[PDB]
């Protein structure tokens, strides 16, 4: 029962991760520097 | 400024060359107290040159 519950919780937390900020490249780090160009 | 985070610092280069040429230009023509001075080829028309 513990193994099954752990697997279910793992599936749930993984589902919560695949709906995060995924739909985009991880490159081109943002440039939120300042108002001074 | 395509974007705020870019901070697109412009490089004023055309202005630089413009000034570098204009300084020499003025040092060529306007350097002398006078602008030009006519010159003739004979003495019969030299009284009018000056």
Automatic annotation (TrEMBL), chain A:
- UniProt name for this protein: Uncharacterized protein
Note the residue range shown relative to the complete protein: 201 to 237 of 250
TrEMBL record, chain B:
Specify the protein name.
Answer: Portal protein
Which part of the entire protein is covered? 51 to 100 of 747
């Amino acid at each position: 029962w513990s193994a099954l519950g752990k697997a279910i919780l793992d599936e749930m937390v993984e589902q919560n991760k695949k709906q995060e900020y995924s739909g985009s490249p991880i490159a081109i780090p943002n440039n939120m520097t300042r108002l001074q160009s | 400024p395509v974007t705020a985070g870019s901070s697109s610092w412009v490089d004023r280069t055309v202005w630089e060359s413009v000034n570098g040429t204009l300084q020499d230009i003025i040092n060529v023509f306007c350097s002398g107290d006078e602008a030009v001075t006519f010159v003739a080829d004979n003495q019969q028309d030299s009284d009018a040159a000056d």
